[PDB]
């Protein structure tokens, strides 16, 4: 019927209608050579324009309609345009006209042009810092002083010395390759000065978190996950042993404040170790993806040349690691719901969500990973060039699926090919 409306104001289409817009190109021509380069940067806007006419035999209703369309064409913002050629769309005006010929007593002819209207991994370290700070604040706040000569002081001293011994064993395992003498001496001094630290709660927690950060300052991206896993297991043994004995006739002999001061310390140490482990896992994923990014993807002729932990390479290993991290952090949050409550739990939940989301997104790459069913055993190079178009990353196809010999990719099983 040739009827179209702008901001629900009618008009009847007339002689001309067009659309235009293509790809933005940069065209460079190299001097003293025949070849030239052409590159694409995005897509140009669609500069759709049309013409319309408004006539009525009343010769005054025509003026009213023309004025209404003028008012609806000059207005702030973007309004919908209905057009037989274009269809419903949101655009903004750029210009128009009302050329009437002073002889055509009923004719008003507009012409309009319109344009369309304009419409995690980096957040893990901050959450780790916040969790460590909250744990330190909780420990100092809940730590209580005890008399010097009683058996409660002896028990607390033994537990603190054991914790320092565990950290010392971790540093000693680290020091086979590196120089850890300064941290070892600091830990020895801390162990020697235990009785001073027991009475002052803030200094004890501050020194313990400083020691944990010092341990973290020696670990490369290769050994961080392994060392933090070992420390997490070591602290988990102590926490389980001291928490499994809740009510016993021999546990009745122990002082209550000493037991509280021991349980809080054990939980805080365990939670801190687990948080550093999760952050290390995320960093290992980042390192692996950077290693993958290092390789080029462009077709290049070969030239004569003359000059992540293994647990994070496969896909089932990543699945198992994600399951382990989720279960461990959920249990830690459930424990924190009692001893050491408040932010401790709120912060661990946030960290677990962030870390699990990071592992699920980057580790498994569920967006651009297809599953195929090979009909026969093929080399990774062929089986990847057939499905993607580049055989450069033939190592990753043979490594993610867990194949030992890359030539004999197994035939009748699902293969995870990254596009």
């Amino acid at each position: 019927t040739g009827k179209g409306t702008f901001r629900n104001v009618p008009f009847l289409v007339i002689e001309e209608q067009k659309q235009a817009g293509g790809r933005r190109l940069v065209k460079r021509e190299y001097p003293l050579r025949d070849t030239g380069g052409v590159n694409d940067l995005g897509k140009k806007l669609r500069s759709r324009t049309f013409s319309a006419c408004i006539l009525n035999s009343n010769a005054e209703t025509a003026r009213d309609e023309a004025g209404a369309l003028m008012d609806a064409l000059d207005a702030p913002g973007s309004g919908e345009l209905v057009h037989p050629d274009f269809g419903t769309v949101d655009v903004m005006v750029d210009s128009w006209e009302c050329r009437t010929k002073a002889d055509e007593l009923n004719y008003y002819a507009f012409t309009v042009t319109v344009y369309p209207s304009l419409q995690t991994s980096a957040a893990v370290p901050a959450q780790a810092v916040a969790v460590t700070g909250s744990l330190g604040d909780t420990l100092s706040s809940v730590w209580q002083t005890v008399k010097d000569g009683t058996a409660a002081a002896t028990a607390v001293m033994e537990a603190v010395t054991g914790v320092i011994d565990d950290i010392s064993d971790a540093v000693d395992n680290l020091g086979v390759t590196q120089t850890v003498s300064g941290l070892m001496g600091s830990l020895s001094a801390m162990k020697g000065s235990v009785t001073s630290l027991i009475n002052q709660p803030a200094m004890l927690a501050s020194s313990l978190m400083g020691a944990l950060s010092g341990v973290s300052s020696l670990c490369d991206t290769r050994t961080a996950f392994s060392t933090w896993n070992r420390l997490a297991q070591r602290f988990e043994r102590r926490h389980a042993a001291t928490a499994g004995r809740q009510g016993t006739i021999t546990t009745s002999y122990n002082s209550p404040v000493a037991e509280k001061n021991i349980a809080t310390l054990n939980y805080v140490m365990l939670a801190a170790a687990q948080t550093y482990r999760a952050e290390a896992a995320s960093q290992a994923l980042t390192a692996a993806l950077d290693f993958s990014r290092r390789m080029d993807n462009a077709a290049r002729a070969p030239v004569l040349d003359a000059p992540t932990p293994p647990v994070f390479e496969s896909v089932s290993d990543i699945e198992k690691t994600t399951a382990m991290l989720g279960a461990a952090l959920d249990s830690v949050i459930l424990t924190a719901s009692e001893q050491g409550f408040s932010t401790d739990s709120v912060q661990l939940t946030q960290l677990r969500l962030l870390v699990v989301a990071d592992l699920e997104k980057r580790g498994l790459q569920l967006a651009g990973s297809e599953s195929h069913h090979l009909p026969e055993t093929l080399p990774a190079m062929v089986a990847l060039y057939r499905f993607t178009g580049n055989s450069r990353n033939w190592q990753r196809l043979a490594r993610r699926n867990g194949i030992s010999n890359p030539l004999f990719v197994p035939g009748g099983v699902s293969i995870e090919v990254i596009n």
């Binding site: 980096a122 957040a123 901050a126 810092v129 460590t132 700070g133 330190g136 604040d137 300064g182 001496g185 600091s186 001094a189 801390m190 000065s193 803030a202 200094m203 501050s206 020194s207 978190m209 400083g210 020691a211 950060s213 010092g214 990014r293």
Partner: protein
């Protein structure tokens, strides 16, 4: 999002062209607006010497005094502008006035608070270091020296960098720690510019000067160690020899020497690598304005660029007719705006200091 210039007495809302500048490499932030009025009206409220407060939307960006007002008219066109800086710029061109030039045993914050008293500028100290607060064994004032010159000399000696706050105060700023925003090439960039020159970066900076021998230390220090002082800071980015020797600025010990040598190395690192971008919106992703001293994550991988995190160094907001709403944001590596104590990511005291340095929101023991 209207730019209101609270002058003396009343508000002024509409403008023809707006340009605001802010940076941490400077002690003031200048603005320039354009006013179009019928020929013959009165523009008194916009006069040199008036007390202005610029307010973008509902937030204040600059505060201080108006500097210049240009009016021109030809046979075809007519143009009126207006300018101005912060109230911290009142120190830049004003000579420091104090009764006794020499301060015997004072810290940088106390010296600054004693020097910025007659004008009205309030000093703000943000660093929580234990070595940046070390007092000067003696600090004299060259006569006819501006407050800017004296405080910049002292800040260079200490390694701290001075800057003007958004409320007109003086600030001894601290670099940011948490990555808050993301700039990528595919989503929210209209234009990038990555310059990487190595015409200034050297390998081994080394500073030499004279020891302290005035008064109490004069009965102790021998003759040779008065003249023999040294400090070194080595860079690992330049693989050739490329040394540099710096004659010191004041009386210098070994720890002070290394401090300035590092300050010099980090300033060269900041001045070498530079990123520039033109984003579309004045406001941030969360919603606030774009301001300096922010740690952003750069994801310009499509142009083969391997930088991951940068720190904003200069933000200029524009409201031209040909431009629209734009803000040209410049980025420099964070490791160039740090104090010599801290580093970019031997006892119980060291462990506690490391903990309270990793967690700045905590209260130190002091």
């Amino acid at each position: 999002n209207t730019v209101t210039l609270r002058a003396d007495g009343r508000l002024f809302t509409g403008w023809t062209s707006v340009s605001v500048t802010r940076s941490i490499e400077s002690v003031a932030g200048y603005f320039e607006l354009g006013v179009n009025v019928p020929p013959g009206t009165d523009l008194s409220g916009l006069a040199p010497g008036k007390k202005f407060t610029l307010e973008i939307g509902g937030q204040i960006v600059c505060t201080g005094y108006i500097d210049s007002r240009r009016r021109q008219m030809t046979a075809d066109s007519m143009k009126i502008t207006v300018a101005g800086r912060d109230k911290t710029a009142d120190l830049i061109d004003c000579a420091a006035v104090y009764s006794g030039g020499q301060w015997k045993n004072r810290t940088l914050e106390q010296i600054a608070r004693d020097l910025c008293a007659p004008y009205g500028v309030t000093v703000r100290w943000e660093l929580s270091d234990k070595e940046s607060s070390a007092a000067f064994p003696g600090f004299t004032l060259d006569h006819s020296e501006t407050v800017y010159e004296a405080l910049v000399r002292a800040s260079r000696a200490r390694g701290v960098l001075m800057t003007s706050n958004a409320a007109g105060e003086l600030v001894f700023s601290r670099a940011a720690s948490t990555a808050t925003d993301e700039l990528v090439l595919g989503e929210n960039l209209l234009t990038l510019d990555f310059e990487e020159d190595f015409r200034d970066r050297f390998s081994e900076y080394t500073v030499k000067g004279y020891a302290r021998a005035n008064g109490a230390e004069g009965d102790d220090i021998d003759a040779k160690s008065i003249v023999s002082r040294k400090g070194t800071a080595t860079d690992s980015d330049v693989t050739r020899y490329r040394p540099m020797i710096i004659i010191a600025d004041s009386k210098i010990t070994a720890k002070d020497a290394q401090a300035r040598a590092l300050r010099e190395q980090r300033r060269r690192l900041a001045k070498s690598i530079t990123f520039e971008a033109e984003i579309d919106g004045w406001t941030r992703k969360d919603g606030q304005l774009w301001m300096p001293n922010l740690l952003v994550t750069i994801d310009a991988s499509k142009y083969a660029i391997k930088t991951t995190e940068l720190l904003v160094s200069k933000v200029t907001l524009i409201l031209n007719d040909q431009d629209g709403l734009k803000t040209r944001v410049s980025l420099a590596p964070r490791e160039g705006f740090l104090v010599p104590v801290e580093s970019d990511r031997g006892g119980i005291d060291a462990l506690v200091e490391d903990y309270y340095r990793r967690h700045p929101e905590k209260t130190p023991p002091w």
